[PDB]
Design a protein around this ligand. Structure first.
Ligand SMILES: Nc1nc2c(ncn2[C@@H]2O[C@H](COP(=O)(O)OP(=O)(O)O)[C@@H](O)[C@H]2O)c(=O)[nH]1
Ligand SMILES: [Mg+2]
Ligand SMILES: [Zn+2]
Lengths: 39, 201
Protein backbone atom coordinates (compact mmCIF):
# COMPACT_ATOMS: atom_id res chain seq x y z
CA UNK A 1 0.00 0.00 0.00
CA UNK A 2 1.45 3.30 1.17
CA UNK A 3 4.98 1.87 1.17
CA UNK A 4 4.32 0.89 -2.47
CA UNK A 5 2.47 3.98 -3.68
CA UNK A 6 2.60 3.92 -7.47
CA UNK A 7 5.61 5.82 -8.76
CA UNK A 8 4.79 9.04 -10.58
CA UNK A 9 5.97 9.13 -14.21
CA UNK A 10 9.29 10.99 -14.26
CA UNK A 11 9.30 12.74 -17.63
CA UNK A 12 11.98 15.30 -18.53
CA UNK A 13 11.19 16.84 -21.91
CA UNK A 14 8.48 14.25 -22.53
CA UNK A 15 5.12 15.96 -23.02
CA UNK A 16 1.51 14.83 -22.74
CA UNK A 17 -0.43 15.80 -25.87
CA UNK A 18 -3.21 18.18 -24.85
CA UNK A 19 -5.55 16.86 -27.57
CA UNK A 20 -5.39 13.07 -27.13
CA UNK A 21 -3.25 12.62 -23.95
CA UNK A 22 -0.59 10.40 -25.57
CA UNK A 23 2.91 10.78 -24.11
CA UNK A 24 5.53 11.91 -26.62
CA UNK A 25 9.33 11.97 -26.58
CA UNK A 26 11.29 15.21 -26.07
CA UNK A 27 12.64 15.18 -29.63
CA UNK A 28 9.32 15.26 -31.51
CA UNK A 29 7.23 18.43 -31.77
CA UNK A 30 4.20 16.64 -33.28
CA UNK A 31 2.12 13.95 -31.60
CA UNK A 32 2.83 10.51 -33.06
CA UNK A 33 -0.83 9.48 -32.59
CA UNK A 34 -3.09 12.41 -33.57
CA UNK A 35 -0.44 14.40 -35.50
CA UNK A 36 -1.26 17.70 -33.78
CA UNK A 37 1.67 19.97 -33.00
CA UNK A 38 2.76 20.30 -29.38
CA UNK A 39 0.39 22.43 -27.30
CA UNK B 1 2.13 14.00 -13.14
CA UNK B 2 -0.21 11.01 -12.81
CA UNK B 3 -0.19 7.33 -13.75
CA UNK B 4 -2.21 6.76 -16.92
CA UNK B 5 -2.59 4.28 -19.77
CA UNK B 6 -3.98 4.56 -23.29
CA UNK B 7 -6.70 1.92 -23.68
CA UNK B 8 -8.20 1.29 -27.13
CA UNK B 9 -11.80 0.06 -27.23
CA UNK B 10 -12.46 -1.88 -30.44
CA UNK B 11 -15.11 -4.18 -31.83
CA UNK B 12 -17.86 -4.26 -34.42
CA UNK B 13 -20.23 -1.33 -34.61
CA UNK B 14 -23.32 -1.77 -32.48
CA UNK B 15 -21.67 -3.93 -29.81
CA UNK B 16 -22.00 -1.25 -27.12
CA UNK B 17 -18.53 0.34 -26.96
CA UNK B 18 -19.79 3.90 -26.59
CA UNK B 19 -22.53 2.91 -24.14
CA UNK B 20 -19.92 1.06 -22.08
CA UNK B 21 -17.28 3.78 -21.79
CA UNK B 22 -20.02 6.35 -21.05
CA UNK B 23 -21.03 4.65 -17.78
CA UNK B 24 -18.08 6.38 -16.06
CA UNK B 25 -19.57 9.78 -15.30
CA UNK B 26 -16.35 11.74 -14.80
CA UNK B 27 -14.79 10.17 -17.89
CA UNK B 28 -17.76 11.49 -19.85
CA UNK B 29 -17.72 15.02 -18.41
CA UNK B 30 -13.95 15.31 -18.95
CA UNK B 31 -13.78 13.57 -22.33
CA UNK B 32 -11.61 15.03 -25.10
CA UNK B 33 -12.43 15.05 -28.81
CA UNK B 34 -9.58 14.33 -31.24
CA UNK B 35 -10.70 15.88 -34.52
CA UNK B 36 -7.86 14.54 -36.69
CA UNK B 37 -8.74 10.92 -35.89
CA UNK B 38 -12.43 11.21 -34.99
CA UNK B 39 -12.05 9.92 -31.44
CA UNK B 40 -13.35 10.76 -27.97
CA UNK B 41 -10.79 10.03 -25.24
CA UNK B 42 -12.47 9.36 -21.89
CA UNK B 43 -10.12 9.73 -18.87
CA UNK B 44 -11.38 7.08 -16.44
CA UNK B 45 -9.94 7.29 -12.92
CA UNK B 46 -9.94 4.21 -10.69
CA UNK B 47 -8.77 4.39 -7.07
CA UNK B 48 -6.54 1.46 -6.13
CA UNK B 49 -4.98 0.46 -2.82
CA UNK B 50 -1.68 1.90 -4.15
CA UNK B 51 -3.13 5.14 -5.54
CA UNK B 52 -5.13 6.38 -8.51
CA UNK B 53 -4.92 4.97 -12.03
CA UNK B 54 -6.34 6.66 -15.13
CA UNK B 55 -7.41 4.71 -18.22
CA UNK B 56 -7.59 7.06 -21.21
CA UNK B 57 -10.12 5.07 -23.24
CA UNK B 58 -10.26 5.75 -26.99
CA UNK B 59 -13.84 5.53 -28.28
CA UNK B 60 -14.48 5.63 -32.02
CA UNK B 61 -17.03 7.84 -33.76
CA UNK B 62 -18.48 4.86 -35.64
CA UNK B 63 -15.84 4.57 -38.37
CA UNK B 64 -15.47 0.84 -37.61
CA UNK B 65 -18.80 0.23 -39.39
CA UNK B 66 -17.29 1.00 -42.81
CA UNK B 67 -13.69 -0.22 -42.65
CA UNK B 68 -10.63 -0.71 -40.54
CA UNK B 69 -9.31 1.97 -38.22
CA UNK B 70 -6.28 4.10 -39.03
CA UNK B 71 -2.86 3.54 -37.48
CA UNK B 72 -2.97 6.68 -35.34
CA UNK B 73 -5.93 5.30 -33.40
CA UNK B 74 -3.81 2.34 -32.25
CA UNK B 75 -0.48 4.15 -31.83
CA UNK B 76 0.99 3.98 -28.30
CA UNK B 77 -1.92 1.92 -27.01
CA UNK B 78 -0.84 0.22 -23.79
CA UNK B 79 -3.91 -2.02 -23.30
CA UNK B 80 -7.14 -2.88 -25.06
CA UNK B 81 -10.69 -4.13 -24.72
CA UNK B 82 -12.23 -6.14 -27.55
CA UNK B 83 -16.02 -6.11 -27.35
CA UNK B 84 -18.69 -8.16 -29.08
CA UNK B 85 -22.45 -8.51 -28.67
CA UNK B 86 -23.70 -11.80 -27.24
CA UNK B 87 -26.93 -11.40 -29.24
CA UNK B 88 -25.01 -11.23 -32.56
CA UNK B 89 -22.81 -14.17 -33.51
CA UNK B 90 -21.20 -12.23 -36.35
CA UNK B 91 -19.72 -9.78 -33.84
CA UNK B 92 -18.02 -12.71 -32.10
CA UNK B 93 -16.89 -14.13 -35.45
CA UNK B 94 -15.06 -10.85 -36.16
CA UNK B 95 -13.12 -10.85 -32.87
CA UNK B 96 -10.02 -12.45 -34.48
CA UNK B 97 -9.90 -9.67 -37.08
CA UNK B 98 -9.85 -7.01 -34.37
CA UNK B 99 -7.23 -8.91 -32.38
CA UNK B 100 -5.08 -9.22 -35.51
CA UNK B 101 -5.36 -5.51 -36.33
CA UNK B 102 -4.44 -4.75 -32.71
CA UNK B 103 -1.27 -6.82 -32.40
CA UNK B 104 -0.06 -5.67 -35.82
CA UNK B 105 0.39 -2.16 -34.39
CA UNK B 106 0.78 -2.78 -30.65
CA UNK B 107 2.12 -6.37 -30.39
CA UNK B 108 1.57 -8.14 -27.03
CA UNK B 109 -0.26 -5.49 -24.97
CA UNK B 110 -2.70 -6.95 -22.41
CA UNK B 111 -6.19 -7.37 -23.87
CA UNK B 112 -9.55 -8.18 -22.27
CA UNK B 113 -12.35 -9.76 -24.31
CA UNK B 114 -15.84 -8.59 -23.32
CA UNK B 115 -19.17 -10.07 -24.32
CA UNK B 116 -21.72 -7.28 -23.93
CA UNK B 117 -25.52 -7.14 -23.59
CA UNK B 118 -25.94 -10.17 -21.30
CA UNK B 119 -28.97 -8.45 -19.76
CA UNK B 120 -30.89 -9.63 -22.85
CA UNK B 121 -32.54 -12.97 -22.10
CA UNK B 122 -32.28 -14.32 -25.66
CA UNK B 123 -28.53 -14.91 -25.63
CA UNK B 124 -26.99 -16.28 -28.84
CA UNK B 125 -23.26 -16.51 -27.98
CA UNK B 126 -22.96 -18.62 -24.82
CA UNK B 127 -20.04 -19.50 -22.56
CA UNK B 128 -19.45 -22.80 -24.36
CA UNK B 129 -18.79 -20.97 -27.65
CA UNK B 130 -16.44 -18.31 -26.19
CA UNK B 131 -12.95 -19.76 -26.63
CA UNK B 132 -10.89 -17.21 -28.57
CA UNK B 133 -9.45 -15.80 -25.34
CA UNK B 134 -8.15 -19.17 -24.12
CA UNK B 135 -6.07 -19.46 -27.30
CA UNK B 136 -4.33 -16.07 -27.06
CA UNK B 137 -3.58 -15.32 -23.37
CA UNK B 138 -6.61 -13.05 -22.99
CA UNK B 139 -9.03 -12.60 -20.10
CA UNK B 140 -12.77 -12.74 -20.74
CA UNK B 141 -15.77 -11.24 -18.94
CA UNK B 142 -19.49 -11.05 -19.54
CA UNK B 143 -20.67 -7.44 -19.35
CA UNK B 144 -23.90 -5.45 -19.59
CA UNK B 145 -23.09 -1.78 -20.19
CA UNK B 146 -26.67 -0.65 -19.58
CA UNK B 147 -26.79 -2.26 -16.11
CA UNK B 148 -23.12 -1.63 -15.13
CA UNK B 149 -22.72 -5.41 -14.67
CA UNK B 150 -19.03 -6.34 -14.25
CA UNK B 151 -18.08 -2.81 -15.35
CA UNK B 152 -14.92 -2.68 -13.24
CA UNK B 153 -13.60 -6.16 -14.02
CA UNK B 154 -11.87 -5.45 -17.37
CA UNK B 155 -10.11 -2.46 -15.81
CA UNK B 156 -9.06 -4.30 -12.64
CA UNK B 157 -7.54 -7.16 -14.64
CA UNK B 158 -5.72 -4.73 -16.93
CA UNK B 159 -4.44 -2.72 -13.96
CA UNK B 160 -3.01 -5.84 -12.30
CA UNK B 161 -1.24 -6.82 -15.53
CA UNK B 162 0.14 -3.34 -16.25
CA UNK B 163 1.38 -2.74 -12.70
CA UNK B 164 2.55 -6.31 -12.11
CA UNK B 165 0.63 -6.71 -8.84
CA UNK B 166 -1.92 -9.56 -8.62
CA UNK B 167 -3.14 -8.16 -5.27
CA UNK B 168 -4.08 -4.72 -6.63
CA UNK B 169 -7.60 -3.75 -5.56
CA UNK B 170 -10.04 -0.93 -6.24
CA UNK B 171 -10.93 0.61 -2.88
CA UNK B 172 -14.28 1.84 -4.24
CA UNK B 173 -16.33 1.67 -7.41
CA UNK B 174 -16.26 4.76 -9.66
CA UNK B 175 -19.35 6.93 -9.89
CA UNK B 176 -21.42 5.32 -12.64
CA UNK B 177 -24.54 6.36 -14.52
CA UNK B 178 -27.61 4.77 -12.87
CA UNK B 179 -28.57 1.46 -14.50
CA UNK B 180 -31.07 1.71 -17.33
CA UNK B 181 -31.91 -2.01 -17.14
CA UNK B 182 -31.84 -4.53 -14.30
CA UNK B 183 -29.37 -7.41 -14.53
CA UNK B 184 -31.21 -10.43 -13.14
CA UNK B 185 -29.04 -11.73 -10.26
CA UNK B 186 -29.93 -15.35 -11.04
CA UNK B 187 -29.11 -15.05 -14.74
CA UNK B 188 -25.82 -13.44 -13.71
CA UNK B 189 -25.02 -16.31 -11.34
CA UNK B 190 -25.98 -18.84 -14.02
CA UNK B 191 -23.73 -17.15 -16.59
CA UNK B 192 -20.85 -16.92 -14.11
CA UNK B 193 -21.32 -20.65 -13.51
CA UNK B 194 -21.42 -21.38 -17.25
CA UNK B 195 -18.06 -19.63 -17.70
CA UNK B 196 -16.46 -21.60 -14.86
CA UNK B 197 -17.39 -25.07 -16.13
CA UNK B 198 -16.17 -24.06 -19.60
CA UNK B 199 -12.77 -23.03 -18.22
CA UNK B 200 -12.48 -26.53 -16.75
CA UNK B 201 -13.48 -28.20 -20.04
N1 LIG C 1 -29.97 -4.50 -23.71
C1 LIG C 1 -28.65 -3.86 -23.81
N2 LIG C 1 -28.45 -2.94 -24.92
C2 LIG C 1 -27.16 -2.26 -25.09
C3 LIG C 1 -26.12 -2.45 -24.23
N3 LIG C 1 -25.10 -1.69 -24.67
C4 LIG C 1 -25.51 -1.04 -25.78
N4 LIG C 1 -26.80 -1.40 -26.01
C5 LIG C 1 -27.38 -0.74 -27.23
O1 LIG C 1 -26.70 -1.26 -28.51
C6 LIG C 1 -26.88 -0.09 -29.52
C7 LIG C 1 -25.42 0.35 -29.93
O2 LIG C 1 -24.86 0.98 -28.81
P1 LIG C 1 -23.37 1.69 -29.05
O3 LIG C 1 -22.75 2.04 -27.72
O4 LIG C 1 -23.55 2.94 -29.91
O5 LIG C 1 -22.44 0.58 -29.83
P2 LIG C 1 -21.03 0.94 -30.57
O6 LIG C 1 -21.29 1.26 -32.03
O7 LIG C 1 -20.12 -0.26 -30.47
O8 LIG C 1 -20.39 2.13 -29.89
C8 LIG C 1 -27.46 0.85 -28.91
O9 LIG C 1 -28.90 0.87 -29.27
C9 LIG C 1 -27.30 0.53 -27.28
O10 LIG C 1 -28.41 1.10 -26.54
C10 LIG C 1 -26.31 -3.42 -23.06
O11 LIG C 1 -25.42 -3.62 -22.29
N5 LIG C 1 -27.57 -4.09 -22.89
MG1 LIG D 1 -19.73 3.93 -30.66
ZN1 LIG E 1 -2.11 13.65 -29.67
Amino acid sequence: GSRFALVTPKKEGHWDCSICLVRNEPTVSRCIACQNTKS
Amino acid sequence: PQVQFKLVLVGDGGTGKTTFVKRHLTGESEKKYVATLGVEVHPLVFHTNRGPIKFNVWDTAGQEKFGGLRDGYYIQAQCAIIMFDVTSRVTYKNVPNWHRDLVRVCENIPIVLCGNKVDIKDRKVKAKSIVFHRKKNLQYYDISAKSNYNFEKPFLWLARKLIGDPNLEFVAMPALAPPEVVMDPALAAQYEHDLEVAQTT
